[PDB]
């Protein structure tokens, strides 16, 4: 016999993409009230959930993706650190267990500035990635880092999002390490930002490609696998432009389905990487087959 | 920047079931000439794999399952040790990565005696699990351990399967550590052996259950997910009784669909755990949702 260990495996998943090395890094999981946030009848998501063997508050993974192009070490999204509950902020640890040091990261690309994507930028009041530049969309930054917008926040108190994006990015801004880009942009060789606005004013997709092998890093372009693959147009109360999100999601899915390449998203079951094919009304997400990397 | 690490994470997946702890143990992966194995025209198989973004030779998982019942630590299947080439035999290492020691395993349940399941019983010339009692269906033992049956398989190195089983289980028989059962039989509390003969004469399913949460360990009841879930009728050349495997697979699938409980299988993409639901003609496998245990 033995005492139960009750600990999950290190939160990182290795995958080769052409000549690049991808490592999904889990920040952990948090239970979310799916029913209340979806723009569709409560009974409808409760049914979608049940068909996916999902329960009331969905335990959702929060993920970031490390890309090592063999020339640059780039991290896509950084998790929440301590901005979104006691159950997140595991990225830094997983990055190290993944075999890397925060100091080795050259660049950080932000899909959007929500707490669960920018919190990891800071370890206390010190840059968590001291030797990297932070890249995000200009519209994204002009929205969250806006003093005006903060003091102009609706459901006040819960405007810690503005405070949140600020404490996470300003330190790099003042260190002269924030380099915003505008929409579709060539970044480091092998990676490109594609403007997939809607979830937020400057939400960005990061397309990774090596040797004809592509991986579109979707950010929060999709939030609930149980309903948004089958019905791509269903949005949430968390999206800025519902119709923009819908249009961009359908474009992303159509394209990846047409091209047969990989996609990943911050909240699909960790590692959250897979292919996507057409299926009647919408799409069928196909998780990557398990594969050993030596 | 930094050199690419290129190593997969430890191959162990934690999951709680009632008061039990389940740890899927990856023994590695092996490529399988799947289109040659399935008993249907090659083009058909190849088309099914494609719809799932796959191609043969197909990287296929080989998994074993550790169950800590609190009072007992049992291992269901053990991987191949060396019997199948250098890409396997990692179950031992992964068990330790999982925070357990081979010497702590109390019992070992074998779904069947193919090499990729009993190989890990031995480490070199030594018992890998020195303090464990091994269990299997007597029909399985009578068949694989029969010097006669070996001397009746003209198929040069098919006798290997017979030798594999023998070399793998006789050290335990010789030590009085082998205890067969016949047909359905309650093993330690929380775990039942249910006959599922077909793949091999005594192929057995192990059902674990705690606090109403059920997990059926199906062994090799399914080999190619991209084919056999949509078509439970397709068999393979390694199946002893074709009709029987089909029947037992359908019974398992129909049962997990109506019960809505979890099922696990040695060759479903690591960790190979999920639920099953009927979809038109046949079934659809829904892999467990990533979950953090603390
Ligand atoms: K360090
Ligand atoms: K923009
Ligand atoms: K750059
Ligand atoms: K119990
Ligand atoms: Na730059
Ligand atoms: Na290219
Ligand atoms: Na030991
Ligand atoms: Na019983
Ligand atoms: Na029988
Ligand atoms: Zn978001
Ligand atoms: Zn998010
Ligand atoms: Zn097998």
Quote the number of domains for chain B.
Answer: 1
SS3 at position B170:
helix
Report CB contact under 8 Å: A7, B70.
no
d(CA B34, CA B235) in angstroms, rounded, equals 11
Select the residue of A6, A8, A100 nearest B5 (Cβ to Cβ): A100
Peptide bond before residue A271 is cis, with ω within 30 degrees of 0: yes
- Cα A21 to ligand 11 centroid, rounded to whole Å: 23
User: Exposed/middle/buried for A176, CB within 10 Å: 0-12, 13-18, 19+?
Assistant: exposed
| Separation CA A156–CA A154 (nearest Å) | 5
With beta carbons less than 8 A apart as the criterion, state whether B222 and B201 touch.
no
Residue B76 · residue B272 · CB < 8 Å: no
Nearest CA in chain B to A7: B294
Strands B58-68 and B20-32: antiparallel
Tally DSSP H helices, then E strands, for chain A: 9, 15
To which residue do tokens 């399967």 refer?
B161
To 10 degrees, the CA torsion angle through B46, B52, B54, B60?
A: -100
CB A79, CB A88: distance < 8 Å: yes
Q: Which runs of E-coded beta strand occur in B88-212?
A: 107-109, 122-123, 126-127, 133-135, 185-186, 191-195, 204-210
C-alpha A254/C-alpha A258 separation (Å) is 6
Name which of A245, A237, A158 is nearest A205 in CA terms.
A245
A9 and B5 within 8 Å at the Cβ level: the answer is: no
- Tokens at A158, concatenated: 């819960």
What residues sit around ligand 8, an ion, with C-beta below 5 angstroms? B 186
Cis peptide bond N-terminal to B57, omega within 30: yes
Q: What is the DSSP string of B2-31?
A: ------PPPSEEEEEETTEEEEEEEEEEEE
Calpha distance B271→A290 (Å, rounded): 8
Antiparallel, parallel or unpaired: β B12-17 and B20-32: antiparallel
Q: Give, for A287, the enclosing helix (H) or strand (E).
A: strand A282-287
Helices (H) and strands (E) in chain B, counts: 9, 15
Instruction: Give the integer Cα–Cα distance in Å for B64 and B66.
Output: 7
CB count within 10 Å of CB A106 equals 18
Question: Which listed ligand is nearest to B83 at the C-alpha?
Answer: 12
β-bridge partners, A61 = A29
**Angle, CA of B149, B152 and B153, to the nearest 5°:** 95
Closest-CA residue to A117 (of A21, A27, A207): A27
Residues of the domain holding A12: 1-294
Query: How far does the CA of residue A103 sit from the closest CA of chain B (Å)?
Result: 9
Alpha-helical segments (H) within chain A: 34-37, 42-51, 91-97, 115-118, 138-144, 147-150, 160-174, 225-228, 242-259
Set of chain B residues whose Cβ sits within 8 Å of the Cβ of A277: 51, 53
> For residues B260 and B214, is the Cβ–Cβ distance under 8 A?
no
A81: nearest Cα among A121, A25, A134? A121
Q: How far is the CA of B99 from the centre of ligand 2 (A)?
A: 47
Element (H, E) at A69: none
Residue B186 CA to ligand 8 centre (angstroms): 5
Question: Does residue A139 contact residue A202 with C-beta atoms inside 8 Å?
Answer: yes
Q: Which helix (H) or strand (E) holds B148?
A: helix B147-150
Contact A220, A118 (CB under 8 A): no
Q: ∠ at Cα A169 (A164, A174), nearest 5°?
A: 135
**CATH code, B66:** 3.60.15.10
- CA dist B36 and B148 (Å) reads 29
A262: which strand partners? A215
Interatomic CA distance for residues A206 and A272, integer angstroms? 15
Strands A282-287 and B12-17, by their bridges, are: unpaired
Closest-CA residue of A relative to B31 is: A291
**Token pair in block for residue B77:** 């299947």
CB B137 within 8 A of CB B182: yes
Sorted by sequence, the CB contacts under 8 Å of residue A135 that are 6+ apart come out as: A107, A108, A109, A110, A178, A179, A180, A181, A187, A193
Report the SS3 class of residue A283: strand
B54 contacts in A (CB within 8 Å)?
289
Q: Is A49:A55 a contact under the CB 8 Å cutoff?
A: yes
User: Chain A residues with CB inside 8 Å of B267's CB?
Assistant: none
Q: Mind telling me how many Å the CA of B271 is from chain A's nearest CA? A: 8
* Structure-block tokens of residue A282: 């919408």
Question: What was the structure determination method?
Answer: X-ray
Is residue A203 within 8 A of residue A219, CB to CB? The reply is: yes
A119 phi and psi angles, rounded to 5 deg: -50, -40
CA distance A107 to chain B (A): 9
Element (H, E) at B65: strand B58-68
Residue pairs spanning A and B at CB distance below 8 A: 128
Strand ranges for A69-217 from DSSP E: 73-76, 107-109, 122-123, 126-127, 133-135, 185-186, 191-195, 204-210, 213-217
């Amino acid at each position: 016999a033995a005492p139960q260990v009750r600990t999950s495996a290190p939160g990182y998943y290795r995958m080769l993409l052409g000549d690049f090395e991808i490592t999904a890094l889990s920040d952990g999981t948090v239970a979310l009230p799916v029913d209340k946030r979806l723009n569709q009848p409560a009974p409808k998501t409760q049914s979608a959930l049940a068909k996916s063997f999902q329960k009331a508050p969905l335990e959702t993974s929060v993920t970031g993706y490390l890309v090592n192009t063999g020339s640059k070490l780039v991290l896509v999204d950084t998790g929440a650190a301590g901005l979104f509950g006691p159950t997140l902020g595991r990225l830094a640890a997983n990055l190290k267990a993944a075999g890397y040091q925060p100091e080795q990261v050259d660049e950080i690309y932000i899909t959007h500035m929500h707490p669960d994507h920018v919190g990891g930028l800071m370890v206390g009041e010190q840059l968590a990635f001291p030797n990297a530049v932070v890249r995000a969309d200009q519209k994204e930054a002009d929205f969250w880092l806006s003093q005006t917008n903060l003091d102009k926040a609706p459901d006040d108190e819960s405007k810690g999002f503005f405070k949140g994006a600020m404490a996470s990015l300003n330190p790099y801004v003042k260190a002269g390490k924030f380099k915003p880009f505008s929409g579709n942009t060539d970044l480091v060789p092998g990676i490109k930002a594609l403007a997939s606005h809607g979830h937020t004013p400057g939400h960005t997709t990061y397309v990774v490609e090596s040797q004809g092998q592509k991986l579109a890093l979707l950010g929060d372009l999709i939030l609930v696998a149980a309903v948004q693959f089958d019905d791509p147009s269903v949005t949430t109360q968390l999206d800025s432009d519902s119709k923009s999100v819908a249009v961009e999601r359908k474009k992303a899915f159509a394209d990846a389905a047409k091209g047969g390449y990989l996609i990943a998203a911050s909240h699909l079951s960790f590692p959250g990487i897979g292919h996507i094919r057409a299926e009647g009304k919408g799409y069928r997400f196909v998780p990557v087959n398990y594969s050993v990397v030596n």
